[PDB]
Amino acid sequence: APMGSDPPTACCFSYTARKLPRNFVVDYYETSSLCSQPAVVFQTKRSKQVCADPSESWVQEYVYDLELN
Amino acid sequence: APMGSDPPTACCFSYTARKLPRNFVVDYYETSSLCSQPAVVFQTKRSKQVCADPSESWVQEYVYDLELN
């Protein structure tokens, strides 16, 4: 059926500059795909969501910890 | 006070390919600014929002009509 048209896309334009302490990341969220530059988004406690360069190994590590417990 | 962190940004990655008939644009919405590539978003009746290249004169014209009545 006629699906949506072509809305924008929540793509990160940059990233923070400090690794969020595990005590500051209760969850996370990934970007879209349309834009050729997706990224991982960490959800904290006194903020909302923070973009993170997947190129930083610590980002992949925190994601793994979130996949576990 | 401690504002938000650095959430993603609703930036358009592309644009439709056909001018939306005036009978298909009851309103519109502009993108953010963080990303060096903002754009205008038209709100239709059987969709939601559609990105549009501000380089197309018809896009600037429809925006003017929306600023009037």
Domain that holds residue A17: 1-69
CATH number of the domain bearing residue B7: 2.40.50.40
How many residues are recorded in chain B?
69
3-state helix/strand/coil string of chain B: CCCCCECCCECCCCCCCCCCCHHHCCEEEECCCCCCCCCEEEECCCCCCEEECCCCHHHHHHHHHHHCC
Q: Are the Cβ atoms of B50 and A13 closer than 8 angstroms?
A: no
Inter-chain touch B35–A2, beta carbons under 8 Å: no
Q: Chain A contacts of B49, Cβ < 8 Å? A: 5, 7-8
Q: Please state, in angstroms and rounded to a whole number, the distance separating the CA atoms of residues A46 and A29.
A: 16
Question: Considering only residues 7 to 36 of chain B, which have any Cβ-Cβ distance to chain A shorter than 8 Å?
Answer: 7-16, 31-32, 34-36
- Return the structure tokens found at A37: 């530059």
* Minimal CA separation from B68 to chain A, in Å: 24
Edge-first strand listing for the sheet containing A27-30 = A27-30, A40-43, A50-52
Domains identified in chain B, total number = 1
- Technique used by the depositors: NMR
Cβ B8–A31 below 8 Å, yes or no? Answer: yes
Rounded to the nearest angstrom, the gap between the alpha carbon of residue A27 and the centroid of all alpha carbons in its chain is: 10
DSSP state string for A18-58: SPPPGGG-SEEEE--SSSS---EEEE-SSSS-EEE-TTSHH
Q: Does B5 touch chain A (CB under 8 A)?
A: yes
